[PDB]
Coordinates of C-alpha atoms and ligand atoms in Angstrom, one line a residue:
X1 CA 0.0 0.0 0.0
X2 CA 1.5 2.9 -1.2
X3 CA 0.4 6.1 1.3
X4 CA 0.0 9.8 -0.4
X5 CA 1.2 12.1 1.8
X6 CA 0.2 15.9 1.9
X7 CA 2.8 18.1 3.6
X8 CA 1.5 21.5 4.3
X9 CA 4.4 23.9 6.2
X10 CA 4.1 27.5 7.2
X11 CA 7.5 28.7 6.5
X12 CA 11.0 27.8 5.9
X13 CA 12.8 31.2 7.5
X14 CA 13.4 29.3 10.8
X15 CA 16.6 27.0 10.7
X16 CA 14.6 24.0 12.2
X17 CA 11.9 23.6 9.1
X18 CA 14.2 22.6 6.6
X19 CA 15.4 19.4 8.8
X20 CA 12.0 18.7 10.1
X21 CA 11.1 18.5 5.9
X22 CA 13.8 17.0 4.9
X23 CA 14.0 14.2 7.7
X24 CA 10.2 13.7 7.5
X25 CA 10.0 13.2 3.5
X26 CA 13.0 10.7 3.5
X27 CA 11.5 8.6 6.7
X28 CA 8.3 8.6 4.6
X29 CA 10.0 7.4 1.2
X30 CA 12.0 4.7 3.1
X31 CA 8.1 3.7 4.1
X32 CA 7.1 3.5 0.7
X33 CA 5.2 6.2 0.7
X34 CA 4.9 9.4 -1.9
X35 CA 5.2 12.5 -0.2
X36 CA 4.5 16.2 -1.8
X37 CA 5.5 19.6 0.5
X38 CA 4.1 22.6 0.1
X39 CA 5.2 26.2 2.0
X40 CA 2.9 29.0 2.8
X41 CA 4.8 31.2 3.2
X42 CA 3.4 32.2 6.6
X43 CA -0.1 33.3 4.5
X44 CA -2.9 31.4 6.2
X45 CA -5.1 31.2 2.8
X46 CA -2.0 30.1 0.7
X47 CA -2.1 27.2 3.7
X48 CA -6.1 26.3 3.0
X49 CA -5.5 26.3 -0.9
X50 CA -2.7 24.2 -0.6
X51 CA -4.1 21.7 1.5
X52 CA -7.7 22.0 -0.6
X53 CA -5.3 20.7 -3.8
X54 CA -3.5 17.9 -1.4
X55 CA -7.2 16.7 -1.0
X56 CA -8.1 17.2 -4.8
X57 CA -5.1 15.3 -5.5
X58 CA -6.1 12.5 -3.5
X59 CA -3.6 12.5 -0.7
X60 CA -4.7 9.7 2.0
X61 CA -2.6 11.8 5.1
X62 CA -2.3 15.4 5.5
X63 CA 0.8 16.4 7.6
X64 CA 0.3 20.1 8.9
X65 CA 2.4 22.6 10.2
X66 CA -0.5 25.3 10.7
X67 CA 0.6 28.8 10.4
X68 CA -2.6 30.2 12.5
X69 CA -3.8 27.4 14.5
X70 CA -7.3 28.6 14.5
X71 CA -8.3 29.1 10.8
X72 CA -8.2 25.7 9.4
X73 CA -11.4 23.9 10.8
X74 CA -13.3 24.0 7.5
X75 CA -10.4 22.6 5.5
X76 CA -10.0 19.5 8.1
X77 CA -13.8 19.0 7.7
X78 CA -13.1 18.8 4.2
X79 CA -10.1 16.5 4.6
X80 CA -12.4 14.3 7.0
X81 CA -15.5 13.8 4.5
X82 CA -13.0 12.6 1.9
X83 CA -11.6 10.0 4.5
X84 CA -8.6 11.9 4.6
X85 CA -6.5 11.9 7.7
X86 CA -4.8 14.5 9.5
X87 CA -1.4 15.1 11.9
X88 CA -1.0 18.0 13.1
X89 CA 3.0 18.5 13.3
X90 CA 4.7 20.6 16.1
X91 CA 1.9 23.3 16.6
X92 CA -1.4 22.1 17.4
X93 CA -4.7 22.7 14.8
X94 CA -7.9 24.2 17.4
X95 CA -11.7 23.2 17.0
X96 CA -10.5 20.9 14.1
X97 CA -11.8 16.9 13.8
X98 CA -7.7 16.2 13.3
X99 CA -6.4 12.2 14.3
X100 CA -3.5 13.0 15.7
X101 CA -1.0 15.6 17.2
X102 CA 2.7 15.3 18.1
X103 CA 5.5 17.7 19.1
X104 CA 7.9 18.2 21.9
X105 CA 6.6 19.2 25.2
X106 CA 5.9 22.8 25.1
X107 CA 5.1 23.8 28.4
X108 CA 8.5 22.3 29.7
X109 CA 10.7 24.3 26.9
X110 CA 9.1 27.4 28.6
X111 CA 9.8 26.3 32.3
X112 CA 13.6 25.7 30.5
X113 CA 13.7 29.2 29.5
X114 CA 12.3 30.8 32.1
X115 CA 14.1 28.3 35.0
X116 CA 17.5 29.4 33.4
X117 CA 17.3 33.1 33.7
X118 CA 15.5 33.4 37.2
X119 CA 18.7 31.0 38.1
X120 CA 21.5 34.1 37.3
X121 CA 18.8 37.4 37.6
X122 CA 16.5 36.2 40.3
X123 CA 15.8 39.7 41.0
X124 CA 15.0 42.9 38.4
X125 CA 13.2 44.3 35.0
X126 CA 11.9 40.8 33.0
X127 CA 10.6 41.5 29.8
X128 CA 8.6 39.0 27.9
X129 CA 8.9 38.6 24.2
X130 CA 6.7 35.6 23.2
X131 CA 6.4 34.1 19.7
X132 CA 3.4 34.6 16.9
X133 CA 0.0 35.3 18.6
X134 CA -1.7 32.9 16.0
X135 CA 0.6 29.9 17.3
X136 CA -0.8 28.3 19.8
X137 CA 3.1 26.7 20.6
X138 CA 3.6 30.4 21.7
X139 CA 0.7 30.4 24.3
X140 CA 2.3 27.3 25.7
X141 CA 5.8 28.6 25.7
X142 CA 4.2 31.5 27.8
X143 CA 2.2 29.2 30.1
X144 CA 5.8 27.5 30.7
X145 CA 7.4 30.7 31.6
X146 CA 4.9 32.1 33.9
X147 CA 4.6 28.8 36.0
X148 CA 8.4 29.2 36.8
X149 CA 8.0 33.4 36.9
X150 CA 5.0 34.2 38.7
X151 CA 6.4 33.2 42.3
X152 CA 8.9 35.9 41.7
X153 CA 6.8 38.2 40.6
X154 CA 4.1 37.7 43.5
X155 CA 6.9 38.6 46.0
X156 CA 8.1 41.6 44.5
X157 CA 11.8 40.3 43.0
X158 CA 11.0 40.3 39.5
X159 CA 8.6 42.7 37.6
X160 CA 7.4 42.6 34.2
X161 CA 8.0 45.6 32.4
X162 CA 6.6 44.6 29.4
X163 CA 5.0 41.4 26.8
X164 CA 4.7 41.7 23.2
X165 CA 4.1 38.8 21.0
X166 CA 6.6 38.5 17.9
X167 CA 4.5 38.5 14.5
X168 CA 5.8 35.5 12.3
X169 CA 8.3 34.5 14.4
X170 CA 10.1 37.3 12.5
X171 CA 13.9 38.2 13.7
X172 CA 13.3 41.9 12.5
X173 CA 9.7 42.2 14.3
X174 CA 12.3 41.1 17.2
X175 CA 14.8 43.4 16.7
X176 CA 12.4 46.5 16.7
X177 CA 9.9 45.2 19.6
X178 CA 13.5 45.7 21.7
X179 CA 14.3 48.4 20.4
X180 CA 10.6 50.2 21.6
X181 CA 10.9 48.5 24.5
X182 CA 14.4 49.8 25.8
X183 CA 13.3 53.4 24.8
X184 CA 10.1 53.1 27.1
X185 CA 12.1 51.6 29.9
X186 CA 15.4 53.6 29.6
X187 CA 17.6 50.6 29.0
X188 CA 16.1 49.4 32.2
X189 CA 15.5 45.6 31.5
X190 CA 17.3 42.5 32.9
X191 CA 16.7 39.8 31.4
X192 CA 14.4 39.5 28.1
X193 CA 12.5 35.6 27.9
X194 CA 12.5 35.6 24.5
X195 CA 10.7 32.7 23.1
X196 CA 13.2 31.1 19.8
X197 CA 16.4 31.6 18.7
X198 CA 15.3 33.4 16.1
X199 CA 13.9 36.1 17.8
X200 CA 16.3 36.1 20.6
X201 CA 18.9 37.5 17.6
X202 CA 17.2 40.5 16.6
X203 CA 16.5 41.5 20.1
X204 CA 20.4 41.0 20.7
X205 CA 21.2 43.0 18.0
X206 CA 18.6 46.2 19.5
X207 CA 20.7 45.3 22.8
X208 CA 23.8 45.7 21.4
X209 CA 22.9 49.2 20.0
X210 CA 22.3 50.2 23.8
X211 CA 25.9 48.1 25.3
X212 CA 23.6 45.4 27.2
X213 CA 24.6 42.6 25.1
X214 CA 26.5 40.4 27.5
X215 CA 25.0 42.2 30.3
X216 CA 21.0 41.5 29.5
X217 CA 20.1 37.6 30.2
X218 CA 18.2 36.5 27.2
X219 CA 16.7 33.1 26.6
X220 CA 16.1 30.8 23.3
X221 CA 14.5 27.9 21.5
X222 CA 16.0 25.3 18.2
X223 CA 19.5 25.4 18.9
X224 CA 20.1 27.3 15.6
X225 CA 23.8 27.6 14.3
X226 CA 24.1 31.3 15.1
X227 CA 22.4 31.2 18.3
X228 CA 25.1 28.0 19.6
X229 CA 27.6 30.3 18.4
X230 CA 26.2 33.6 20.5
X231 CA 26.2 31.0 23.6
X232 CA 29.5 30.3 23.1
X233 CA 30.3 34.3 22.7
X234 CA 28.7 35.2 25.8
X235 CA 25.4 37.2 23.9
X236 CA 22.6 34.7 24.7
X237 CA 22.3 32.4 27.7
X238 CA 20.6 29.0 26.7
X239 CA 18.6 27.4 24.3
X240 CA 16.3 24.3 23.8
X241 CA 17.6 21.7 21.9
X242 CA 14.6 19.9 20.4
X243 CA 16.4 16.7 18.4
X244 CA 14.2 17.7 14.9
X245 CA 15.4 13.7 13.8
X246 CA 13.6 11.9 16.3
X247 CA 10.0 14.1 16.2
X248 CA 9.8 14.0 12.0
X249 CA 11.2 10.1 11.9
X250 CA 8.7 9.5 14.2
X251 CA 6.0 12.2 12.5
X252 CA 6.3 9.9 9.5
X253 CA 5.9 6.3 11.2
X254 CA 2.5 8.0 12.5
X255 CA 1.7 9.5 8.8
X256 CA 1.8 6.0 7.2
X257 CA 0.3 4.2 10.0
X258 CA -2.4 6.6 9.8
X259 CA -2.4 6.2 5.9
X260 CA -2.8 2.4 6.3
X261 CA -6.1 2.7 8.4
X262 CA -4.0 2.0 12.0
X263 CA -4.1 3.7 15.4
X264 CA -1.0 5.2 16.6
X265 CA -0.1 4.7 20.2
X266 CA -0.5 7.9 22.3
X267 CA 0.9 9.1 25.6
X268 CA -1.8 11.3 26.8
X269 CA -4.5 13.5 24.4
X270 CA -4.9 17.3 24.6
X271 CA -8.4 18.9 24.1
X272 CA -8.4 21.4 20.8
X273 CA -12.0 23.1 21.7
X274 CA -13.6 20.2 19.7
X275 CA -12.3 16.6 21.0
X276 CA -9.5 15.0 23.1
X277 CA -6.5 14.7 20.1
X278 CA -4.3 11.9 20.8
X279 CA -0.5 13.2 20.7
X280 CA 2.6 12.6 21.4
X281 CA 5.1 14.7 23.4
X282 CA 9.1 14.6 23.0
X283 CA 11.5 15.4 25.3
X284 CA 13.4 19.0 25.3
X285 CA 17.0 19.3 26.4
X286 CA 18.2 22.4 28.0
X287 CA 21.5 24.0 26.3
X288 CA 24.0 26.3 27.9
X289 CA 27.6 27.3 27.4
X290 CA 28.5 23.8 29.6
X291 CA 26.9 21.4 27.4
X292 CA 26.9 22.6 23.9
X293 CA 29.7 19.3 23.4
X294 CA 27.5 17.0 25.0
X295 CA 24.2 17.6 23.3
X296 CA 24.1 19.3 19.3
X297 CA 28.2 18.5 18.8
X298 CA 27.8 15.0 20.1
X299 CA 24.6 14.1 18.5
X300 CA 25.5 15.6 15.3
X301 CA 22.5 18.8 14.9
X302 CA 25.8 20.9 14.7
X303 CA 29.0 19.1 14.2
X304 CA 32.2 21.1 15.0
X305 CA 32.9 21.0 10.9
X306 CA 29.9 22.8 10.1
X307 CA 30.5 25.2 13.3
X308 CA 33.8 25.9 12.2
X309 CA 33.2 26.2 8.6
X310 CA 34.2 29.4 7.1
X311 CA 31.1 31.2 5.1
X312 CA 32.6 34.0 3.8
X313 CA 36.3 33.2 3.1
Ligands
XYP1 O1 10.5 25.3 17.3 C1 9.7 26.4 17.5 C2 8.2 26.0 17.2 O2 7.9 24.9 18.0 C3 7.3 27.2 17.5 O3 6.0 26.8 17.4 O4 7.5 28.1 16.4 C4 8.8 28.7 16.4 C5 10.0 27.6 16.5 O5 11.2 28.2 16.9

């Protein structure tokens, strides 16, 4: 039984998305299956089209990466009518009829980020920079941050001084929510719980305009290349390391089994507004200056050869 597989991304500007496509369409092929990608480039109608000619095509799986979680009910209903079934990968789909969920656990990568800077500023200005306000990842990364914040904040060590969200993710939307925010707090911030990598190096860049890079705790998400290498320099203090082989290898086991008319074994569900989705939650690893070696270098996400190569000369 060959499975068609419909893989419908949001973007491809965030380091991780090329190795969660990449890893996830090989994984399927060595299943046998056929697999077609498709990007929307962060446009939640280009998403709905796309998927609407994955299920004219006669795709038996769709594989989503949602751009706005909350937009794409109608489009699973028509999935669902043509006995079409539907994963929703890394970011949860909400008040959608979807079969299955899986990502790493969310809520913990916030505790991560959150644990790590209370640990070296437990007292001062926290400012909160969370990720896209149509992913619901985001609300979770928040929820993770607040359980390990709000004691602190409740007795007076830490305030909040500010919360924006970070539309698409986007390291320039980043760079200038800093920017405003150290104007209206007159450099006055400690620590900024920035929610990704990605955004973490646009608000280091607004920081270093100011001479607080190096000074201002500032937390992260992927374990992109850069943001290793601004660990290593002293510019941002941690990251999650989320191993992208294990969750799309696994991602496409579910997608065929799922093609094949199976039920894939879940740990737990989580309730979307419509049902209880079964899902799956991986484990993520926190990253520091200390154990950079012993996690990304060791299992290979960034080998010293590609850390050390040379991009420009
Ligand atoms: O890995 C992160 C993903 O889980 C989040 O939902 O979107 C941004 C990424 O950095």
């Amino acid at each position: 039984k060959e499975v068609k597989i419909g893989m419908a991304i949001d973007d491809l500007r965030l380091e991780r998305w090329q190795k969660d496509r990449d890893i996830f369409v090989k994984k399927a092929e060595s299943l046998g299956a056929k697999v077609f990608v498709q990007s929307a480039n962060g446009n939640e109608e280009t998403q709905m089209s796309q998927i609407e000619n994955m299920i004219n095509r006669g795709v038996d799986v769709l594989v989503i990466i949602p751009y706005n979680g909350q937009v794409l009910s109608n489009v699973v209903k028509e999935a669902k009518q043509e006995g079409i079934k539907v994963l929703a990968y890394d970011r949860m789909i909400n008040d959608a009829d979807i079969d299955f969920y899986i990502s790493f656990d969310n809520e913990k990568v916030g505790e991560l980020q959150a644990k790590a800077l209370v640990d070296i500023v437990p007292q001062g200005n926290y400012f909160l920079m969370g990720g896209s306000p149509v992913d619901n990842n985001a609300k979770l990364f928040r929820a993770g941050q607040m359980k390990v914040l709000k004691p602190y904040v409740d007795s007076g060590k830490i305030k909040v001084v500010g919360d924006q969200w970070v539309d698409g993710w986007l390291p320039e939307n980043a760079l200038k929510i800093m920017e405003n925010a150290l104007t209206a707090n007159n450099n006055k911030i400690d620590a900024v719980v920035a929610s990704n990598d990605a955004t973490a190096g646009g608000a280091i860049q607004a920081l270093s305009a100011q001479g607080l890079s190096g000074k201002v705790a500032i937390s992260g998400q992927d374990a992109d290349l850069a943001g290793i290498k601004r660990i290593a320099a002293g510019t941002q203090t941690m990251t999650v390391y989320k191993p992208i082989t294990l969750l799309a290898n696994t991602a496409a086991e579910i997608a065929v089994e799922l093609g094949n008319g199976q039920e894939p074994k879940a740990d737990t569900t989580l309730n979307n507004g419509l049902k209880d989705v079964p899902s799956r939650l991986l484990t993520p690893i926190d990253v520091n200056k200390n154990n950079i070696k012993d996690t990304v270098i060791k299992d290979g996400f960034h080998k010293e050869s590609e850390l050390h190569h040379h991009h420009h000369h």
